Every structure is written in C-alpha cells, then in structure tokens.
Amino acid sequence: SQVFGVARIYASFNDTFVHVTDLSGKETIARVTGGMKVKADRDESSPYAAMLAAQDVAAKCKEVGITAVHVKIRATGGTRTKTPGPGGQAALRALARSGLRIGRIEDVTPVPSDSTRKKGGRRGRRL
Amino acid sequence: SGRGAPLAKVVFRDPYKYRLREEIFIANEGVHTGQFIYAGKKASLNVGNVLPLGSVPEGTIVSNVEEKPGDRGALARASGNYVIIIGHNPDENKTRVRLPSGAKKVISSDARGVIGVIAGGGRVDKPLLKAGRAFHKYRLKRNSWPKTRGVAMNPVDHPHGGGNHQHIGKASTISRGAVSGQKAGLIAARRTGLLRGSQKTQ
Amino acid sequence: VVDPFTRKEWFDIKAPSTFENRNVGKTLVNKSTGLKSASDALKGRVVEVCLADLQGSEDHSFRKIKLRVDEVQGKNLLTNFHGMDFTTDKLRSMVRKWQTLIEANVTVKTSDDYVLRIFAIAFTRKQANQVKRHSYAQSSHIRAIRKVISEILTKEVQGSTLAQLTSKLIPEVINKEIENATKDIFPLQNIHVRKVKLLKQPKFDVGALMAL
Amino acid sequence: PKKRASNGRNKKGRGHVKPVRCVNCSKSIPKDKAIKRMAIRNIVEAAAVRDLSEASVYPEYALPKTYNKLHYCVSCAIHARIVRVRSREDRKNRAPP
Amino acid sequence: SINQKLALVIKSGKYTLGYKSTVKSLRQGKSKLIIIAANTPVLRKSELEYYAMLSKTKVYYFQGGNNELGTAVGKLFRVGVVSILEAGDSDILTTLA
Amino acid sequence: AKRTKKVGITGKYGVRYGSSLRRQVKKLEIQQHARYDCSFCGKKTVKRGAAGIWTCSCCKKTVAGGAYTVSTAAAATVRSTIRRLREMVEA
Amino acid sequence: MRAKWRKKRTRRLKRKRRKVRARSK
RNA sequence: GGUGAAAUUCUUGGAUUUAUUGAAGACUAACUACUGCGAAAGCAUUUGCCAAGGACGUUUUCAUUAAUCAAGAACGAAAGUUAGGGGAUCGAAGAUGAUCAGAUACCGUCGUAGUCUUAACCAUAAACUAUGCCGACUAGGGAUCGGGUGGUGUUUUUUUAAUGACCCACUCGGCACCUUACGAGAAAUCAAAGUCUUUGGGUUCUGGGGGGAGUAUGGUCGCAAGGCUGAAACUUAAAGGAAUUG
RNA sequence: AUGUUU
Ligand SMILES: [K+]
Ligand SMILES: [K+]
Ligand SMILES: [K+]
Ligand SMILES: [Mg+2]
Ligand SMILES: [Mg+2]
Ligand SMILES: [Mg+2]
Ligand SMILES: [Mg+2]
Ligand SMILES: [Mg+2]
Ligand SMILES: [Mg+2]
Ligand SMILES: [Mg+2]
Ligand SMILES: [Mg+2]
Ligand SMILES: [Mg+2]
Ligand SMILES: [Mg+2]
Ligand SMILES: [Mg+2]
Ligand SMILES: [Mg+2]
Ligand SMILES: [Mg+2]
Ligand SMILES: [Mg+2]
Ligand SMILES: [Mg+2]
Ligand SMILES: [Mg+2]
Ligand SMILES: [Mg+2]
Ligand SMILES: [Mg+2]
Ligand SMILES: [Mg+2]
Ligand SMILES: [Mg+2]
Ligand SMILES: [Zn+2]
Ligand SMILES: [Zn+2]
C-alpha cells in the first residue's frame, strides 16, 4: 500500500549522509549530505545539519513518489569506529517527522573478522 | 642446445596411416620416460596431458599454451614458467589466463596447453660466476655477448659515444617514435630508477 | 536542469514464487532507449526483503532474503532466491558471553543444479538446575556437534531443489532436526541457519523460473 | 612499588595475550588489559521512539538494538571517565558498579 | 595393524621375500597371500596378479614402497613382494579385505 | 678429516668471484650433484644429466625436473593443485 | 638522559670507533 | 576527506555515497573469561594426516635408574640481515599541511624498508610473577579447568539400563582468588616473600655504595647490526627502597 | 588547544 525506498543513513564523524535509494539500491533518489546544508567545515556532522539534510531528502523523495523507507543505519565501520555519528539520530528524526513512513530499521555497519590492522600505530593517536 | 628446459620426445600413432609420429614437446616437471601422454578435448587432468583451456578448471597450471588454436604452443615455454587459468567465458568461449609476465590474456577456449610447469625451473638462481660460463651459454644461442657499452664507444659508433668523460649526455629514455639508430638506451620508458613498492598496476 | 526522474518509469518487483506474497515493492529505472535498454538496466538488481515482510508473520523479523531479478516481464520483475542472512541486531543478540558459540559451514550442491554455502550457528545453554554460571562445551562436544550439523545440512541439501530448500528454511525444520540430533551432546538453545549464500548459478532455465 | 596485587591487567598462567586496538585512539593494548564495555543501545535512543512508532507502518515493530563491544586503553578510559582513579582500598573491588 | 601382523608372521610364520621366490611359491601352490609394494612396476604387479588368480591366492596391496615393505618385514633391504607360506600364530590370512 | 671449514665444493673456485656468490653457487651445486631417491625403483640412484633431466642409474628411468633439484617446490605445489582440481572435476 | 637513548648514543660511538680503528691497520 | 579548529588531498575526466561482481594480500572480531595448552618465546576459522604431552585411573612393569647442574647443546617475541615469492592494510625513513618563537615532534595526507611467506642467519626484550629448581611441613573458604569415585539424585531416549548435559559430596592435579595471618618483612605486602641470631633438607646462578661502564682492551660468535665474556685509571657522600605529612 | 626560565 506504500512505495518503499531505502534510507541508507551513513552517520560518520565529520559528516552524515542521508541517501535514499530504491529497494535494490541501484537507483538513488536525492542523496543529501549534512555538509551541503551548513558552511562551517565542522558542523557537517552536527545534528542540525543532519536534520536539514534529511528534511531536504524527504522533501525531494515525496515529489518523486517515495512514501515509506526501510532504514539502514551505518557508522564508518571497517576498522575505524563501529559507532554511528551524532547526525544519524537527527537524520532519522527528520525522516520520520517529514511525513515519510519508517520501516525495518537495521544497523549495517561493516564489522570485520579482525582484519585490516588499524591506523594510528601501536601507541595510538597522542593528544 | 640453447634451451634451459628439457624436451620430451612423445611418440603417437598416426590415426590415418600405419606409422608413428614423433613430436617434440617441452617437458613439464614430473614427466618421465615411458609415461603415457593424453592430448585432446577428452584427456584427463594429469601433468603432461594436453588439454583445451576451456576443458580445465579455474586455477589449473598449464604450459606451452597456444595463443590461437592450432598454433601448437606459444606461451609459457621457458624453463620454470607456467600459465594460470583464472576463469572461463563459456558464451563466446574464452578463457582468461595469467601469463608468466603477470599479464592477463583472453584466449580462445579451444587453445591447448600442457598441464604442469615447464621443467628446468630455478635455472637463473645460480650465478654464472664466470665470463666463460656466459660465453658457453650464448655460444649455443646467438652472437649477443659480450656487450660493449655504448658509452665506451666513439660518437660515430653509438649515440652514447664520445666526450672527455664517459657519459650519456642526454636522457637515455628514448621516444617510442624514434627511428633506427636512435633507439639506444631505455626505449619508451614509462619510469626509471630503482623500483620500490608493488608491481601490477591496474 | 535535467530532472533525471522525468525519464524514469516504475516497475513492480513480483519477486518471489512461493514465500507467502507475490508483491514486494516498486523500483524505478531509466526508460528504454536505443543504446541503453531498461531490460538491460534491470534483470540484475538484488533486493533484500525481510522474511517477516514476505510471510506476513512478525516472528520472521530476522532472516532477510536476497532476491535477484531473473526476468523483466511487462512491469513485473520475476525473481528467485539469491541468498538469506540474519540481521545484525539478531545475531549480536544471540552472541552472548558465558556460553560457547558453535559455527558450521558447508558447501553443497542442491538436487538440480545449485551450489550453496550454508552457515549455521548454535549456542550452549544452561540447564534448568545448573548452578554453574557459564555452561561451556568441551571442544569435543563442539566437534561432534559441528559434524552432526554438517551432516544434517548436507543431507537437507543434495536432496532438494533451491525452491524446496527455501520452503524448508522458512519453517526452520533444519533447526529442529539439529536440536533433535544434538540434544544428546549438548543443549544448544539457539540453533539457527544464519546464512545461505548462492555461490554459482546454473544455466538460466527460464522454464524453471516461470513458476509464479 | 607494585601498585596492583596481580597487575594492571588480567594475565596469570597465560604469558602472552593478543592485543586489541583502543576504539578511541587506536593504541595497542593487550586484550586482557583493555577496558571492555558492552554498549547495547536502542537505535532511537530516547526521544524519537514515539515519532518512529507513529511513522512505522508495522504495529508493534519492536525496534532493534545496536550491540557494540568497546575496547579502551587505560589512558583513553581514564580520560573519557569509563573508569576512574580510586582509593588504595577501593581498587581492591572487582564488582561492577 | 598390517605392519604388526607382518612382523608377527616374520617372527613366527614362514615366508619368502622377492619376486622370484614369490612366483615360485605361487606356481607351487604354497602361497597363502602375496603383498605387493606400492612402487612395484605395474607389469610385474599385473603378472603377480595373474599368478595369484591362477593359484587362487589373495593379493594385498601394501601402501608403502619397497623400502617400507622391507622395513615392515624387518629387513634392511628393499622387498617388492612378500609371499606368506605359513601364517603361524597370526591373523593376517583372515583379517583382510 | 674436514679439509675445508665452509667452502665445501666451492673450494675449486679459490678466492675468486666473492664469498656470497660462492655460497649461492655452493648450495645449488650440492643440490645438483646430490643423489636422489628413484620414485620408480626406490633406489638412491637418481642423478642429474643436463639441467632439468634426472636419470636413475638403476631401471634407466629419466624424469623431467628442476634445473638443480629433482622436484621444485613450485612443481610440488602445482602437482597438489592439479590433483585437487582433478578430484573436484571427477566429483 | 633516558637510559635507552644513552645506550643508542653509546652504540653509535662504538660504531664510529670501530670504523676509525678499521681504517687504521 | 581530515581535525579541537584547519590545511595538504580528491572532485561536472562525476569526487564521496549506493548496488552487482571480481582480484590481491593480511588477520582470525563478536564467543573471549582473574578460562586452557606449552620449557619458555608463544598458541584462538573448519576439516584431514603426522607424531608428541600433562593430569587422572591402575592390586601392570623396572627397582634408585634420582635432584640440581660448570663445560657443553635445542628452542627462543619484536626489530634487524641475506636470497626468492608476495606486497591488501598499517607503516621506522623520506616528502608534505598546520601549530609554535622554532617543531624536517606530537596532530593530518601520502609513502620506502618493513609488516606476510620459503630457505638461512640474528639470540636480544619491563624474555616479569622484576619472585631459580627439587622435597617436607604450617590456617580457613568458595569458585573454576581436567580426570576419577559415589548418589532413593534432575533432565535427554533404546527397550530394563546406559552414557550426554546438570546437581550434591569426596578426591588427585592445575590456573588463580578471598579472609586471617601463629609467622615473615623496612614497609608496600607475602600461604610464601613462613617453618632464620631458637641461624644447617639438597642444589645451580647472581650482588657487595653511586658513577666511570656494560665503557676500553683481549678473546669468541655474526654477513652486518651486534651478542657472550669484561676491566682499570679517575670521580663522588650520598645514590637508592618503602612509607608519612604537606 | 597552548603558555619559555627562576
Ligand atoms: K566535519
Ligand atoms: K657521450
Ligand atoms: K608493502
Ligand atoms: Mg567536511
Ligand atoms: Mg593526553
Ligand atoms: Mg651485461
Ligand atoms: Mg660491457
Ligand atoms: Mg675510446
Ligand atoms: Mg651520433
Ligand atoms: Mg641523442
Ligand atoms: Mg676518454
Ligand atoms: Mg608510581
Ligand atoms: Mg612476555
Ligand atoms: Mg573466530
Ligand atoms: Mg577453553
Ligand atoms: Mg652455562
Ligand atoms: Mg621475529
Ligand atoms: Mg601537542
Ligand atoms: Mg638480558
Ligand atoms: Mg631478570
Ligand atoms: Mg658498587
Ligand atoms: Mg620513594
Ligand atoms: Mg630553582
Ligand atoms: Zn586509547
Ligand atoms: Zn630407478
């Protein structure tokens, strides 16, 4: 009874991507990033920027005809963080509050089987 | 003589006339005298057998591989060299192979190869240790040794000749579009200097 | 200034043949042109749909199903089983401390032509009256359990087609078979077939595909 | 002197333990020494649970959780206050708070 | 195992080592079982098989070469084929196949 | 008695060609002049003819092999790979 | 100075002494 | 993209993101624990083969064959060396962007050797439990691993029962832990670091204030880096350990 | 985030 897309929210640090595509994912509809909605070079990951980007993505989606979205949230993954950035929650808030329906939320963060020796050296980042 | 790899004399029966046909294959490692060699589309996957590239599974190691079907062997013929089957394209039948140089080639699936690696491997690991040994090596191949450096010649003899010190004088990297008499040095070199890092650019 | 969505037309992914429900959703693609056919742009798309959204029963919220479009037939994408996997949240919820995790993987050929890799998972469990707080296995019970699971998976496959294997995965009868064959080794609370992977497809066989 | 009765780690009868990288700074720390915290969070943390239950097309969706084991080095754990400096007697307390 | 039974036959029973004595025993009908080394030439193995078929003698194919067969029969030389004339107090004759 | 401490067969080269080159040559000359077990008759009678040819003085069987050893590790790996692929093809 | 860096400086000094002694004969 | 903030960098040759595949090499997450094995270094995907090992059980066998060990040998993290293969990631060097007063440091982007493997070296680590090995004795307790013993035991079916898992109790061996210490210690603390001026079970190694100095020299080992052995002159009244209060 | 000596 609805037209389903896929939200594919990639919420890293320093940026959050709101990228709605079709069910397969081959075709994308209105991929908007948190950096496109703020000019500070540091607010691109911020919840306000993520909310604005997701509002724009939802507005453009419901002119194409996407009424509901299955939700796939990911962090950077690989070997870097495993933890979603601050903007994923705001992006999901704006997606749910802009009229789009929500379905099948999932965490698709890439998780290795202990591969890819991590960047930073054995003494880590020294701050 | 002049070849590192040993040759195998394989005798077959002539299917159309009563007589024997001796063929000179490049012996693969493990091939022995008195061994039965099977060659054809329906021969088994055994070392020394000659099979079409399409009839072997991915990962098969072949040698004396034909570039075109019926050319009787072009690729991976030197001692210790071999070709790796990496996959087949059954529609418009082609087999992807990796050559000894590391290059990926698409060959007709009807082209044949000998299962195994060419015998005589590890040959270049032994230092020649002697100008005499290099002399006897090239005596049975060709008159390409010894080599006088072009920089040790006079200008009339070579582009590198002349000068009050031995030096090239201009870049030794020579354009591919240069003409005969100019192509001395590093012809059409993409890069120069000591190679550091990984090969197989893509 | 192009608006690429003006030239895109919608299609309906009539994806399964027997799961519970024909309709799974819609997808859009560029309209057919001379040098770029929409039928070519389609027919390779893989869609991941929840087994609960395929069966109508909420007890299938995990075990997503991959379906690859095998044929584009008049706004109807007729697909077939392409693979299944548990959800990350479900898998992490079953993977708990103070218990032994047992994993088994088999590479099998189905009855007709299909090559699959089956990953099954199981976890040791506490008894009703256990005082011990971890309930670990003895690394030979693990080997016996892995052997039993491998035999069970290689017997369930090699005796059924891809569609029959799918229709046996939906009820989770393999989980019950593993439980019955392993209850004499270790409790194994959480037996599951966590993943089915399609390794090599046979010839297209449009006749066999045309079952929906 | 020796600050901790066994060590600042958990390794007796082991000898060597494979290292893990701190999730915060990527410092290599032996796995038995690293501070390990399981983070099991709701995907929608606290505020938009109502909004997502309203926008959901499924009644009683029972939204999932994100599970993530965080491995910290000692310096990063102390800086982020996952662990804290304790009194000499309070250090001899292994029960979680 | 097979090596143990062979050692028991060597120490207690009667046997012949080698191709000529094995063929002589096969043609004399006093061979109960012939054990053929893995690396035995195929023509010789086939002819021994034919003799054993003619004399109704069991054939066991030793998994090792002639060196291994000699070691198993407790000798310091290569043995390509062993012929058992009397098994002695050993179950090599019945516990095969 | 031990006539040479380390040069071994390369004592014929005297002080020439460098110690590293003499060592590298020594390893492969030992390999190429070693006696190997015949895989057909079980005797330690296989010796090199020309490079890549290894003949058993007993049973007169010659096998194509490596330049300085009867079987290179690459050839052993290729034999195992071919056996595995043949087994997969047959079953 | 750190004992490790003292050891490294001493090793460099030993290498320099070995070179200067080898150059003489 | 990256950061605290930036910049180097990539980007209408469409960067980043998304989907279907492919290739390469590395690693073996979660399970993973005050848990296991090994002489130590170390060892974490499955399965197959090969030999090995502790503990347990034993009314099996020998009968002192034993303990510790100069000289002498085997193994020995990482880094490093030689020659091949491989070279995804990270990454000494190097190049760069930013900060700074300077910053060829921390932070950022690349990136060679290396990181991986075969064949040879190297033989060093806060190679740590900073606690030699063997033997006996001197408190209590609960866990846990492996084996064994017993039970009107719970649970699983084969058809009596049996194993499997679990509970209770005991026991041997092990990783450890908690309390108290008769006791020990300078104390921190220690079931050993106790059974020491009431001083002796056996044995090996090492130290004699701090530097100079693990230096010089000699010998020896190594391809090298270096390893092992190792002074003296001279100089100095402290250096150091634990704990207390600020 | 940084701020040099006594
Ligand atoms: K940012
Ligand atoms: K010149
Ligand atoms: K590299
Ligand atoms: Mg940015
Ligand atoms: Mg800090
Ligand atoms: Mg030359
Ligand atoms: Mg010259
Ligand atoms: Mg001249
Ligand atoms: Mg000229
Ligand atoms: Mg010129
Ligand atoms: Mg001149
Ligand atoms: Mg301190
Ligand atoms: Mg250690
Ligand atoms: Mg694992
Ligand atoms: Mg364990
Ligand atoms: Mg000694
Ligand atoms: Mg090492
Ligand atoms: Mg700083
Ligand atoms: Mg030391
Ligand atoms: Mg020490
Ligand atoms: Mg002193
Ligand atoms: Mg002090
Ligand atoms: Mg002062
Ligand atoms: Zn850290
Ligand atoms: Zn022979």
Side-chain angles (χ1 to χ4, degrees), chain C residues 1-132 134-212:
Chain C
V1 294
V2 214
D3 204 327
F5 288 120
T6 66
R7 48 171 149 82
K8 280 177 195 303
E9 73 196 279
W10 295 79
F11 282 72
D12 293 34
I13 309 118
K14 266 70 194 323
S17 209
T18 179
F19 262 112
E20 174 89 53
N21 291 346
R22 193 57 65 270
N23 202 103
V24 316
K26 280 173 162 295
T27 184
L28 88 182
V29 82
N30 253 332
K31 67 189 33 181
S32 282
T33 280
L35 50 85
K36 274 189 157 1
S37 325
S39 154
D40 198 273
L42 307 176
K43 218 211 304 285
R45 287 171 182 228
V46 175
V47 289
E48 193 141 53
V49 288
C50 179
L51 193 49
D53 277 17
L54 240 40
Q55 299 317 93
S57 185
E58 265 335 283
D59 56 358
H60 294 289
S61 30
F62 36 102
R63 326 209 263 150
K64 319 177 287 320
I65 294 271
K66 271 177 177 178
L67 298 154
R68 50 161 209 300
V69 184
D70 268 347
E71 188 54 74
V72 53
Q73 178 208 67
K75 302 309 171 333
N76 273 8
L77 285 320
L78 327 179
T79 84
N80 194 27
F81 186 55
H82 190 53
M84 71 102 93
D85 198 12
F86 276 29
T87 58
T88 20
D89 71 82
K90 182 72 210 306
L91 193 92
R92 302 260 58 72
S93 77
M94 331 163 41
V95 179
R96 287 195 71 210
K97 268 181 92 171
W98 324 118
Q99 71 195 29
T100 301
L101 185 154
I102 292 155
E103 279 216 63
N105 51 313
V106 298
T107 306
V108 283
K109 211 204 309 148
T110 72
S111 75
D112 37 14
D113 263 15
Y114 268 103
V115 162
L116 293 195
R117 186 134 48 230
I118 322 293
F119 306 92
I121 197 156
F123 299 90
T124 57
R125 105 191 170 233
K126 298 209 206 178
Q127 300 273 40
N129 68 325
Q130 208 182 175
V131 182
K132 196 140 48 56
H134 45 239
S135 92
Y136 287 135
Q138 244 196 349
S139 155
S140 38
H141 298 332
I142 303 173
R143 281 190 304 274
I145 281 155
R146 217 185 269 111
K147 213 215 291 222
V148 156
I149 295 182
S150 292
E151 259 137 29
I152 279 191
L153 293 175
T154 205
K155 177 187 67 215
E156 290 321 292
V157 205
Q158 292 178 352
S160 302
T161 81
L162 180 65
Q164 276 189 324
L165 182 271
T166 288
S167 87
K168 242 194 275 214
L169 285 183
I170 308 155
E172 320 145 0
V173 307
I174 320 90
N175 309 358
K176 264 263 279 164
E177 214 199 336
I178 291 172
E179 187 152 47
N180 302 294
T182 55
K183 53 180 166 39
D184 231 356
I185 311 165
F186 226 78
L188 253 59
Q189 51 178 305
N190 225 330
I191 293 140
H192 275 284
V193 171
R194 43 163 295 252
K195 209 192 216 218
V196 163
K197 207 189 285 193
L198 190 88
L199 306 187
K200 180 248 318 185
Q201 281 155 63
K203 174 211 158 175
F204 179 32
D205 203 358
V206 51
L209 161 75
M210 269 308 342
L212 54 143

Side-chain angles (χ1 to χ4, degrees), chain A residues 4-7 68-72 92 100-106, chain C residues 53, chain D residues 52 55-58 61:
Chain A
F4 272 96
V6 173
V69 282
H70 301 290
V71 178
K72 284 202 171 342
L92 191 62
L100 254 141
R101 314 297 315 283
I102 294 320
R104 263 48 154 102
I105 309 116
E106 221 207 305
Chain C
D53 277 17
Chain D
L52 259 81
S56 72
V57 279
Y58 319 115
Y61 170 57

Side-chain angles (χ1 to χ4, degrees), chain D residues 14-52:
Chain D
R14 215 82 47 230
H16 182 258
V17 179
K18 279 256 171 49
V20 59
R21 313 298 295 277
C22 162
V23 301
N24 211 331
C25 72
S26 177
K27 166 162 195 103
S28 183
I29 173 145
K31 186 188 159 149
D32 72 288
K33 187 168 180 180
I35 285 94
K36 300 160 264 296
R37 295 298 183 263
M38 251 282 183
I40 306 171
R41 312 209 47 101
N42 273 321
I43 291 206
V44 225
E45 280 331 306
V49 160
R50 187 59 66 131
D51 290 320
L52 259 81

Side-chain angles (χ1 to χ4, degrees), chain F residues 6-23:
Chain F
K6 51 186 75 174
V7 297
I9 194 177
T10 42
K12 63 179 152 191
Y13 300 125
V15 306
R16 304 181 287 282
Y17 319 125
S19 57
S20 292
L21 297 196
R22 284 192 317 264
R23 193 162 56 250

